[PDB]
């Protein structure tokens, strides 16, 4: 079929550009990197999950690398969070379920994202969450042997406290922590602290169990009980994802199905 390989760059998404196929009108996201990127491509070629952004391929045109990635028309989870409010609890629960399915998948194949935040959580046209941007991602398990991490990666409000206080740390609890900060942001519409350090007053209040303060007073006791188990300073005592899957709020029926058309009589 002639022209099937031509894509028009129609708009800047974030550089990330929206590409449309000349013939089929299929939309893809094209990440343009004008020369860490070789690691992003390698990690992307391993990924295949409904809650992880699809990788279609790559092309090197001199100093510029073009990455063909899934287009998610719903945009960023970030823009579904109302400041100081958040979002309805059933929506947050569904996005957290889909976040866990994605993270279970990544950890299962020995990959840690290292930068889970709402900006990197994208939504398709049906509002299905997809983990995106594997630029900071790395291999923490290979040939069934775990590699402890030591590089400081991520975004300060979402990083686990061990990443700031320890020389080495396990990868999986770091991603679990960041998922709990994402859950906080979805239910309160605010970030609890600038960084999880004892010098940060809000972080000290959380360790002092002062849940009568913001953001915790905006959060119902069932999801807050889950946050009490995720945002545990000791990474060895922190809840694991198999046990997040057994939490009472995680399994609480809250969300109705997708609206489906219906008539009467
Ligand atoms: N890395 C990466 C990656 C992979 N796929 C992406 N897909 C999109 O569809 N991007 C997107 C779509 C809308 Cl409607 C709005 C913003 C978007 O990307 C944001 C902007 C910055 N990175 C995430 C975006 N970034």
């Amino acid at each position: 079929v002639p022209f099937v390989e031509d894509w028009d760059l129609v708009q800047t998404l974030g550089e990330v550009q929206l590409a449309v196929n000349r013939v089929t009108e299929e939309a893809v996201a094209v990440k343009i990197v004008d020369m860490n990127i070789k690691k992003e491509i390698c990690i992307n070629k391993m990924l295949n999950h409904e809650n992880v952004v699809k990788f279609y391929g790559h092309r090197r045109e001199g100093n510029i690398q073009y990455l063909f990635l899934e287009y998610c028309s719903g945009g960023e989870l970030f823009d579904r969070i109302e400041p100081d409010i958040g979002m309805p609890e059933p929506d947050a629960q569904r996005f957290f379920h889909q976040l866990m399915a994605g993270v279970v998948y990544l950890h299962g194949i020995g990959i840690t994202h290292r930068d889970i935040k709402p900006e990197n959580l994208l939504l398709d046209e049906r509002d299905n969450l997809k983990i995106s941007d594997f630029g900071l991602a790395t291999v923490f398990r290979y040939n069934n042997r775990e590699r402890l991490l030591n590089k400081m990666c991520g975004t300060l409000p979402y990083v686990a406290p061990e990443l700031l206080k320890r020389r080495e740390f396990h990868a999986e609890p770091v991603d679990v922590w960041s998922c709990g900060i994402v859950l906080t942001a979805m239910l309160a519409g605010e970030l609890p602290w600038d960084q999880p350090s004892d010098s940060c007053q809000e972080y000290s209040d959380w360790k002092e169990k002062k849940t009568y303060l913001n953001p915790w007073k905006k959060i119902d006791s069932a999801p807050l009980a889950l946050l009490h188990k995720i945002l545990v300073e000791n990474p060895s005592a922190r809840i694991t994802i198999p046990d997040i899957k057994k939490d009472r709020w995680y399994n609480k029926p809250l969300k109705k199905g997708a609206k489906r058309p219906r008539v009467t009589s």
Side-chain angles (χ1 to χ4, degrees), residues 1-4 6-14 16-33 35 37 39-44 46-58 62 64-150 152-164 166-197 199-258 261 263-265:
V1 183
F3 323 126
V4 77
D6 302 321
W7 303 77
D8 305 307
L9 303 178
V10 300
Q11 64 181 97
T12 291
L13 294 167
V16 170
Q17 283 198 66
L18 172 58
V20 175
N21 192 269
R22 187 176 160 176
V23 174
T24 66
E25 273 169 85
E26 289 164 310
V28 300
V30 167
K31 191 177 184 161
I32 298 145
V33 181
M35 302 162 80
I37 190 52
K39 195 192 221 182
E40 183 166 356
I41 287 159
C42 179
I43 285 162
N44 260 286
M46 308 168 62
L47 317 166
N48 179 47
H49 194 266
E50 56 275 17
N51 294 117
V52 178
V53 167
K54 295 285 178 210
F55 179 75
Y56 302 119
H58 69 283
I64 303 150
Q65 269 276 16
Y66 298 96
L67 269 80
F68 291 78
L69 300 146
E70 188 177 354
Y71 172 59
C72 304
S73 69
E76 302 178 5
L77 181 60
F78 185 86
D79 291 326
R80 302 301 186 86
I81 305 167
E82 208 207 304
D84 287 325
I85 288 277
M87 73 175 74
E89 197 167 310
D91 295 346
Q93 196 201 45
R94 179 183 171 271
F95 291 144
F96 195 68
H97 286 159
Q98 300 181 349
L99 179 48
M100 287 304 107
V103 175
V104 165
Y105 169 71
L106 292 181
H107 289 177
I109 62 154
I111 305 313
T112 176
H113 185 273
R114 305 209 277 186
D115 200 26
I116 297 160
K117 53 176 179 189
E119 298 87 336
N120 288 336
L121 304 173
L122 308 174
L123 306 175
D124 72 5
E125 65 294 332
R126 279 170 171 178
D127 270 6
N128 295 303
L129 184 146
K130 323 257 173 173
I131 300 165
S132 81
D133 206 343
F134 287 85
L136 302 188
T138 202
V139 171
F140 78 86
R141 202 196 302 107
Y142 201 79
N143 290 331
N144 252 284
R145 268 294 287 179
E146 180 179 9
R147 301 154 182 234
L148 294 168
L149 303 181
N150 58 67
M152 283 196 270
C153 276
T155 306
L156 278 175
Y158 300 86
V159 296
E162 56 274 26
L163 185 138
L164 304 181
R166 305 299 174 186
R167 186 181 58 95
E168 296 183 301
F169 43 88
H170 289 273
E172 293 168 281
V174 172
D175 284 336
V176 163
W177 180 278
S178 66
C179 291
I181 301 295
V182 166
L183 176 58
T184 307
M186 295 195 285
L187 294 172
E190 85 179 288
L191 291 172
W193 40 71
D194 305 348
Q195 49 186 66
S197 57
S199 69
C200 195
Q201 186 58 55
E202 300 82 1
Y203 184 62
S204 284
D205 296 335
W206 169 254
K207 296 195 288 188
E208 275 154 354
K209 291 208 184 71
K210 296 181 183 163
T211 56
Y212 52 85
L213 300 169
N214 274 350
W216 324 106
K217 51 168 151 179
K218 292 187 247 171
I219 306 180
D220 188 71
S221 64
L224 183 56
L226 176 56
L227 290 167
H228 271 290
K229 296 177 274 172
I230 297 176
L231 308 174
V232 168
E233 176 160 84
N234 176 358
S236 290
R238 188 170 313 154
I239 200 169
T240 67
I241 300 155
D243 280 351
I244 293 169
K245 282 177 176 181
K246 295 165 194 157
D247 166 83
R248 175 177 59 97
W249 175 76
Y250 193 89
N251 289 296
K252 202 178 150 175
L254 298 164
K255 186 83 205 254
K256 291 277 173 209
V263 303
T264 308
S265 281

